[PDB]
Design a protein around this ligand. Structure first.
Ligand SMILES: [C]C1=C([C])[C]=C2C(=[C]1)N([C][C]([O])[C]([O])[C]([O])[C]OP([O])(=O)OP([O])(=O)O[C][C]1O[C](N3[C]=NC4=C3N=[C]N=C4[N])[C]([O])[C]1[O])C1=NC(=O)[N]C(=O)C1=N2[C]1[C][N][C](C([O])=O)S1
Ligand SMILES: NC(=O)c1ccc[n+]([C@@H]2O[C@H](COP(=O)([O-])OP(=O)(O)OC[C@H]3O[C@@H](n4cnc5c(N)ncnc54)[C@H](O)[C@@H]3O)[C@@H](O)[C@H]2O)c1
Ligand SMILES: [Mg+2]
Lengths: 1217, 107, 54
């Protein structure tokens, strides 16, 4: 048996001093990075004056020949609005998908120009965000396809065939000659002769990146290989400086290019790069490795090292490598490369760029809760870094070949004068992007200008392949801080453009301060609370320290005991085994007798006043202290979760982060709300699931505790050890032993706790079937006041994602792989049903199956493991029984092979099952099993019906670029957590408050602002909880009441209309590149069980004020109290003689004495389907208490998370520099 | 239609143009249910007409118009109310219903 | 353009023929000018050969 974590994440090679200095700078504070760069970038006053003069001269020439763009002239000629211009370019794009020129022209002349363009599976406007950048310079993340359709109809009906003709010719020019140098390498090489004769050179980019499958990587490989032949044939011995070369992206050459898969990268990717480099060597052309995301930088250095030390490549100086000056590690990376060039004797071609992925790096660091960014946050810092690194490169031209890739004339001029008077071809060069840089460098290349060479980075590919690179390009030119945007801005003077970034930074009061408008990840929530911190699993120091802490966690003797108020109790003891390897004993659990569980409830009851008397601020301080303890102990907590619950390190980090976030969120919500009149319920039984064994465990207990309730904590029988450690942490944080008792054991302990007479409330997260048993237990019970015992029951999902033909397959597949198979599908939020529009289903399914087979399944104490085990052999048997049933029905089943090592544990391979109809599913299958259905676009509304028809309502995803489809689907889906253009497993506390409806939950949502109010007898007013909107049917009912003479009830109805928070619509603070929305909706149809006329009027007012319809108990005999209702109200009112037939309901209001309430509660619990959140009151309570029925529980919370960076960049961050 | 607004000129020609900014991303939910019902009955041309009406309807348009500072001048498209339908044929009635339901109206 | 340039004279007629004050006569002429320019622009944004007159 392998020792735990003995092979967790060993580095590719021992880290040299130079490599370690790189890693040390990864997230260095910005104020520490800049001073050395300012020193390195300093030049003499004479040079700065000469540079400014050169830069002014370049900028004056640039602005002098600056003519209007072709699209701008087209917009002008036909008086097009922006939407018309965008719609026209979308139409032209589509017409160019028609290959035959004569066929296209007939369609234009005879069909398109004559009105109905719509007549002639894929929205015309799928790429409108890109064309929007071209036309307007601004990025709109999604497409208003109804606005574009209207604009296209309007412009065609107004201007006819001539404007279509001009649009097509424009689009043809741009997509064939401006965004790419050519469609094919042969075409690009032909078009390169003109500028080569003027002194330019070329580096061709075949536009591959981010392989998703093995087949993708093979395709990109043979594309590079075939391009190298064509370029090498064309080079014809010109060599690596005068002649053309190629650029490659490592992400194109392997589907798992990541530090987590470093062994696969070195074993499988490296030989492919070597083979391409050997061919480049034989033709003697340059081969450049493009720089990509920050978490790939250091990994790529291991390939660069091996290649430069490989004797088979000796004699060739064409190996090239990009370094990104916006990165804090850039100068240290250059030190490493220069030293490698010295050791290997290879004159490495070093392309210095600023960096292409800035927005994405900001979002990723925020999402991951890391200490700082790996890039600068002020644009001028990148400029100083660039010039500092150019000085380092220019001092090493004997050993490297510097290549200064920039379109900034100030940057260029500074380096031109820095390099001095001695020049020869091969000393260094400049570089520019095809299309973007020729105006500037025609003022540089040639003995009549600055007589310095420029290599053009030349994209090559079809219209289809060009999109990703294009948005990344167009977003760059649109940012306010970009040189290209500023030189075109008339309000920007040449003096401002030639301003020296080195001197500007040097004179700042605080050198190198972070941007004021970009939050560090820790500060995402500002003054409200401190964000939890994650760990960077791409950082070798982190991996090394985590390796030791994980190993140490595996040597600990973890135990879980019945921790009663009086001290640990005796019981039956057994071992806890690693689900991924039953030979790995993780610890020992002593489980609770039903006698001791009943005793613990009595002890909690006796201790309840002492805990309620701890002021809310001090209870919240305990939570905050507990959060600090968990943050400090995260590495050890990771190791325990990894081994006890079969989680990967990434998932365990998120798990501990979520626990920390619960603690801090409920602490802050407490400080915002709880006062003397919000009395605790009493002893609360917290029953938690195995699959989030720390986070949900902690969240329920922390909420109950901070609301002033003593807690009986019953963890899932599978995962008691992490629960015991969380209880130890909470107790260390100051929660008294009498306020928090741990009762390990199975459902018998849970049931004994629920049944205990003093149990005042139950918080349950788990399966719907178990919640239903607890609901039945509680229906026997009333509080001492004669009211139902509150139950929060957060249960299963049957979560769908709908994908239309506008979505990007690579994005979809990544989000599907994560949503369906992360944690082996053992997330309640996990994707269960993928719904694919028929026209794209085959392509996406092929890509999905290819991605499936790149997953590594195994024991999770290895960083390379993607998917761990299922929790037990019983879970495995249950999942496999489902798979084989489906397989028996003839459904296509895709499964990846499991290594023999999995036999010592309980594993189910990630599985894809292709279904015919959504009704082929019957129950939640809690494992790594994705079902796929196809749908025709016209049946989208029916498909949403089908998703809703399961009765679940937890998470839901939609991948589309089209606003009409977003509006349609999100208005018709009924689920508590929605996700647009991203995965569906985000439940960030306070950002996506988490929890569903129907069979998925009673609410209120964990991690949201209504949660604590359920755990006290009188609910406070949550922060931000109000609405200016009044339900109109409530208003009509209040008027009807006044017309009937029921004046007091009409007043109560109007008060309910005002007090309702129906229509609340908020955006919650969170990471950049995401919009996180929180809204209060009607729950649905509320069952009303009245006893008196006034009671019925109050119940109806409460239900209508919160947007609901009602079914009124016909056995009340109160039909005559509701005669002659307004039609608006009658539409919402039905009478029910058979409650079971008229559901599902979404809640209930009950009026009666205590035994009437108990009887109705039993009848309601017997209704099929969803657990109902029931509120009961006596007639006298209704008369005395306007809040007898609390409106908090008559609305439904909906969280929506929209990935606004999905189009390829972040519009908000484009204005930040 | 309103004088001084974008629907006005279209009343004075035999085929109305699409006015500037005249669109909506919202689809009437009753229109959607009607299209599905027509689908179920096999009235494929009418169901297509219903879907097309649902998309081209500008019901729900909600714009701020340019004007003076210190004012917000808003322009919105709502249902008219109850529309009198005088059909002659079943297909005609389905088409009338599609047009009226797509624009939020009762009939 | 003509109504704008002749607004003072048009004001005088409106004041005496229709009982308007100077301020309201100014508003009257401005609105006429705005109708003219608005329907002109709306025409430039929309009308094509298939939008036949009544
Ligand atoms: C020219 C070139 C070549 C030849 C090649 C390459 C490149 C380039 N790239 C790109 C770069 O990086 C950049 O992005 C551009 O170029 C731009 O820059 P320039 O011209 O310099 O401009 P300016 O304006 O001066 O600047 C801009 C910049 O800055 C920065 N920022 C912004 N904002 C900010 C910043 N920082 C800080 N903070 C703040 N706030 C940024 O950076 C921007 O951009 C590249 N890149 C990369 O990454 N890599 C590579 O490799 C490269 N190359 C190419 C290839 N790839 C790419 C793609 O694909 O896309 S391109
Ligand atoms: N809605 C959410 O937020 C959410 C979150 C996580 C998990 N879940 C659901 O949880 C399920 C998986 O977790 P699980 O396997 O641990 O759920 P489970 O229903 O099997 O058990 C959950 C807890 O209930 C206890 N239990 C079992 N029988 C009981 C009884 N008769 N009375 C009282 N307690 C009893 C168990 O000991 C455990 O502590 C999945 O259905 C998943 O969807 C929901
Ligand atoms: Mg269970």
């Amino acid at each position: 048996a392998p020792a735990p974590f003995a092979d967790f994440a060993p580095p590719v090679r021992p880290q040299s001093t130079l490599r370690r200095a790189i890693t040390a700078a990864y997230r260095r504070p910005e104020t520490e990075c800049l001073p050395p760069l300012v020193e390195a970038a300093t030049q003499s006053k004479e040079i700065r004056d000469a540079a400014a003069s050169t830069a002014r001269k370049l900028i004056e020439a640039l602005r002098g020949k600056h003519s209007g763009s072709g699209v701008e002239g087209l917009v002008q000629e036909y008086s097009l609005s922006s939407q018309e211009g965008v719609a026209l370019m979308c139409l032209a794009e589509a017409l160019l998908r028609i290959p035959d020129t004569a066929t296209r022209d007939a369609l234009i002349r005879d069909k398109i120009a004559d009105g109905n363009w719509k007549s002639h599976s894929r929205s015309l406007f799928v790429n409108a965000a890109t064309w929007g950048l071209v036309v307007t310079g601004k990025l709109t993340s999604t497409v208003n396809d109804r606005s574009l359709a209207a604009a296209l109809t309007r412009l065609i009906s107004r201007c006819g065939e001539p404007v279509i003709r001009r649009g097509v010719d424009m689009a043809m020019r741009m997509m064939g000659e401006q965004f790419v140098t050519g469609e094919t390498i042969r075409e690009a090489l032909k078009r390169s002769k003109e500028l080569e004769e003027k002194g330019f050179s070329y580096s061709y980019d075949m536009l591959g990146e981010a392989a998703t499958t093995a087949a993708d990587a093979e395709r990109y490989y043979r594309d590079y290989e075939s391009a190298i032949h064509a370029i090498g044939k064309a080079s014809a011995g010109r060599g690596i400086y005068e002649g053309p070369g190629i650029s490659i992206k490592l992400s194109a050459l392997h589907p798992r290019y990541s530090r987590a898969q470093a062994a696969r990268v070195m074993g499988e990717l490296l030989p492919r790069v070597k083979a391409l480099a050997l061919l480049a060597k034989n033709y003697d052309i340059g081969l450049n490795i493009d720089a990509e995301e920050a978490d790939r930088l250091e990994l790529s250095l291991d390939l660069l090292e091996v290649l430069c030390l490989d004797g088979d490549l000796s004699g060739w100086n064409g190996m090239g490598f990009v370094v990104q000056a916006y990165g804090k590690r850039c100068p240290f990376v250059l030190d490493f490369i220069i030293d490698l060039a010295r050791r290997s004797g290879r004159r490495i071609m070093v392309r210095l760029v600023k960096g292409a992925y800035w927005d994405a790096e900001i979002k990723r660091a925020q999402l991951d809760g890391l200490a700082d960014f790996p890039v600068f946050t002020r644009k001028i810092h990148t400029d100083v870094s660039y010039i500092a690194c150019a000085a380092k490169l220019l001092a090493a031209t004997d050993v490297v070949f510097p290549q200064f890739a920039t379109h900034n004339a100030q940057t260029l001029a500074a380096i031109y004068h820095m390099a001095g008077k001695d020049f020869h071809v091969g000393k260094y060069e400049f570089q520019c992007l095809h299309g973007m840089g020729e105006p500037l460098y025609e003022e540089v290349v040639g003995r009549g200008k600055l007589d310095r060479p420029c290599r053009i980075y030349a994209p090559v590919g079809t219209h289809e392949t060009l999109l990703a690179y294009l948005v990344r390009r167009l977003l760059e030119n649109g940012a306010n801080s970009s040189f290209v945007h500023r030189i075109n801005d008339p309000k920007v003077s040449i003096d401002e453009l030639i301003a020296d970034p080195v001197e500007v930074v040097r004179a700042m009061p605080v050198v190198g301060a972070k941007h004021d408008r970009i939050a560090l990840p820790a500060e995402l929530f500002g003054d409200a609370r401190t964000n939890s911190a994650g760990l960077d699993l791409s950082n070798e120091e982190t991996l090394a320290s985590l390796t030791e802490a994980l190993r140490e966690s595996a040597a600990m003797k973890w135990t879980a005991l019945p921790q009663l108020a009086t001290g640990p109790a005796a019981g039956e003891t057994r071992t806890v085994l690693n689900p991924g390897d039953h030979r790995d004993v993780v610890g020992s659990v002593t489980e609770t007798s039903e006698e001791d569980a009943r005793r613990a409830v009595r002890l909690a009851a006796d201790a309840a006043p002492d805990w309620a008397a701890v002021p809310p601020s001090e209870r919240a301080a305990c939570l905050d202290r507990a959060a600090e303890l968990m943050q400090a102990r995260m590495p050890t907590l990771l190791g325990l979760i990894i081994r006890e619950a079969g989680k990967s390190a990434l998932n365990a980090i998120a798990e501990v982060r979520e626990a920390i976030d619960f603690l801090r969120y409920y602490a802050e919500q407490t400080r915002r709300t709880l006062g003397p009149g919000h009395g605790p319920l009493g002893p609360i039984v917290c029953i938690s699931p195995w699959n989030f064994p720390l986070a949900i465990f902690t969240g329920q207990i922390a909420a109950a505790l901070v609301a002033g309730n003593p807690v009986l904590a019953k963890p899932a029988e599978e995962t008691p050890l992490i629960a015991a450690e969380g209880v130890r942490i909470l107790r260390e944080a100051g929660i008294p032993a009498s306020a928090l008792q741990l009762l390990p054991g199975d459902g018998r302990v849970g049931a004994a706790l629920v049944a205990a007479a003093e149990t005042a409330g139950v918080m349950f997260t788990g399966s719907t079937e178990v919640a239903r048993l607890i609901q039945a237990q509680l229906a026997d019970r009333l509080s001492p006041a004669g009211r139902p015992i509150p139950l929060i029951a957060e249960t299963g999902g049957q979560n769908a994602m709908i994908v239309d033909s506008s979505a990007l397959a690579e994005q979809v597949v990544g989000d599907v792989i994560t949503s369906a198979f992360d944690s082996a599908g053992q997330r309640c939020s996990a994707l269960r049903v993928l719904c694919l529009q028929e026209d794209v289903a085959d392509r996406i399914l092929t890509m999905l199956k290819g991605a499936l087979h790149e997953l590594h399944i195994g024991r999770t104490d290895r960083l390379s493991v993607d998917v761990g085990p299922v929790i037990t052999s019983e879970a495995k048997d249950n999942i496999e029984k489902h798979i084989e049933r489906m397989r028996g029905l003839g459904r296509k089943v895709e499964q990846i092979g499991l290594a023999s090592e999995t036999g010592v544990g309980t594993f189910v391979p990630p599985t894809i099952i292709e279904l015919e109809k959504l009704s082929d599913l019957q129950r939640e299958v809690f494992g790594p099993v994705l079902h796929v259905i196809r749908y025709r676009r016209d049946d989208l509304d029916r498909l949403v019906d089908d998703v809703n028809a399961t009765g679940y309502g937890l998470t839901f995803g939609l991948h589309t670029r089209l606003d009409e489809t977003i509006a349609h689907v999100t208005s018709r889906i009924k689920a508590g957590n929605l996700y647009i253009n991203r995965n569906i497993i985000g439940a960030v506390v306070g950002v996506q408050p988490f929890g569903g409806r129907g069979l998925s939950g009673t609410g209120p949502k964990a991690g949201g602002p209504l949660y604590l109010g359920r755990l006290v007898t009188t609910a406070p007013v949550p922060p931000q909880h109000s609405s200016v909107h009044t339900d109109p049917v409530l208003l009509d009912f209040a008027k009807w009441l006044d017309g009937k003479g029921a004046r007091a009830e009409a007043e109560a109805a109007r008060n309910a209309g005002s007090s309702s928070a129906l229509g609340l619509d908020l955006e919650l603070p969170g990471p950049v590149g995401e919009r996180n929305l929180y809204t209060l909706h009607a729950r649905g149809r509320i069952l009303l069980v009245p006893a008196t006329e006034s009671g019925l009027y109050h119940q109806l007012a409460a239900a209508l004020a919160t947007g609901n319809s009602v079914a009124i108990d016909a056995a009340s005999g109160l039909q005559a109290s509701l005669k002659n209702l307004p039609q608006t109200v009658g539409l919402r009112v039905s009478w029910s003689k058979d409650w079971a037939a008229d559901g599902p309901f979404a809640g209930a209001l009950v009026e009666g004495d205590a035994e009437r309430i108990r009887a109705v509660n039993k009848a309601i619990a017997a209704l099929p389907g969803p657990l109902l959140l029931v509120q009961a009151a006596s007639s006298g309570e209704i008369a005395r208490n306007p809040d007898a029925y609390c409106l908090n529980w008559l609305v439904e919370e909906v969280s929506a998370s929209i990935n606004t960076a999905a189009a390829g960049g972040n519009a908000s961050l484009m204005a930040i520099g």
